[PDB]
Design a protein around this ligand. Sequence first.
Ligand code: HEM
Ligand SMILES: CC[C@H]1OC(=O)[C@H](C)[C@@H](OC(=O)CN(C)C)[C@@H](C)C[C@@H](C)C(=O)/C=C/[C@H]1C
Length: 397
Amino acid sequence: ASPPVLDLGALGQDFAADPYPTYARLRAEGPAHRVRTPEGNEVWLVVGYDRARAVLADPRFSKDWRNSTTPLTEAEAALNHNMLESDPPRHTRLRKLVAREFTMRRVELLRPRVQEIVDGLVDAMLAAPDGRADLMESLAWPLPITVISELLGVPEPDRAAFRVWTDAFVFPDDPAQAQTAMAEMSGYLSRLIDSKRGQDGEDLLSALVRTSDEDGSRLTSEELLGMAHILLVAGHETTVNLIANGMYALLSHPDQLAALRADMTLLDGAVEEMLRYEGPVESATYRFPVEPVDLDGTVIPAGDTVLVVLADAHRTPERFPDPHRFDIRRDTAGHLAFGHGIHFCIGAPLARLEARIAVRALLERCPDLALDVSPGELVWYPNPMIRGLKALPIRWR
Ligand code: HEM
Ligand SMILES: CC[C@H]1OC(=O)[C@H](C)[C@@H](OC(=O)CN(C)C)[C@@H](C)C[C@@H](C)C(=O)/C=C/[C@H]1C
């Protein structure tokens, strides 16, 4: 169990479009499997709902790179001093710095402005005289980048760069491009950081700079970079792809769409079922076991790289009966789309606010809303960590 049993790159775009038969085939063989990912990394996948849930929570699985046998590349080593790539105590201190910002009740205060963004976006989209636009271009991309940039203080002219950068390190065309995108991003962000110093800004990045400058032990210049990185990315493509993936899932299931429209109180569950069925985090961020870990006979060496395949947990039928059915009334509680345990998503209330407002906006404002593409005209990314589409063509009357 040391060369990979499968090269996911080799399976081409059919794996990208529909990875679930691959993972379910693995599950039927066991909990853990050595694979080569499309970008060339050799890693272990963890499959099946109970094992996935347990590995997510398990402190035998570190997220700290000093526990990884694979070293960080130069560009990645700029950025790793972030909460998601730490264990306690560092994780504990870093999450405390921004916790207050992202509670349900603080994020609720952003409702008028989020609603405002969505309303103007849907307004501009609906101007198309033919009744056809791209929902990714018109809504799903522009909304989250706007909201997070205003929170942090990223000037409007600088926002376009991030789609380009973050695209390159999700679907790298080649291993180099994703490293160079990473470098430019970190450079931009260090320049952004320095530009806040002494300017008395009221934004999140401005507060963090002052915290860092007041006591470097409390937040170091490296941690400030990594924090800015984490908040911009782990939010980015995730929230953008939640909204496009969930709207694709609802528009491809006309029975469900009709039901939601008929009873808009189904909205919250509809967004939960979107996360369950086609959540953006197909596999959780890397875990490194700190000692050999035995998973039903399959031993992962200490220090190897472990992806927990959240997407496969969500299709496990013992936990989610009739799991291939998109059903906005199912009980979704216990899904893993926001993780589980001490790393559970901190942006989860913001993500929910965004996706809820966007989804309801589209339903109320686009009569006869439907996909304007044939199922196989769509293009998904190969990367097993993120589930996402390039375009989502839609139409309305
Ligand atoms: C629908 C959109 C989102 C999804 C699906 C998502 C998913 C996740 C998941 C699965 C994790 C845990 C990863 C792991 O254990 O390996 C995570 C953690 C995290 N998320 Fe999100 N997230 C989303 C939105 C956001 C937003 C909008 C923000 C920030 C403004 C954000 C910030 C973070 C951060 C900082 C962590 C690190 C938490 C920690 O280590 O304690 N996320 N997210
Ligand atoms: C779960 C939510 C996101 O996780 C992250 O932000 C991780 C921590 C990021 O990796 C690093 O920083 C790497 N480190 C060694 C510096 C992102 C950039 C990983 C990538 C697949 C992405 O663009 C999408 C990432 C999401 C899956």
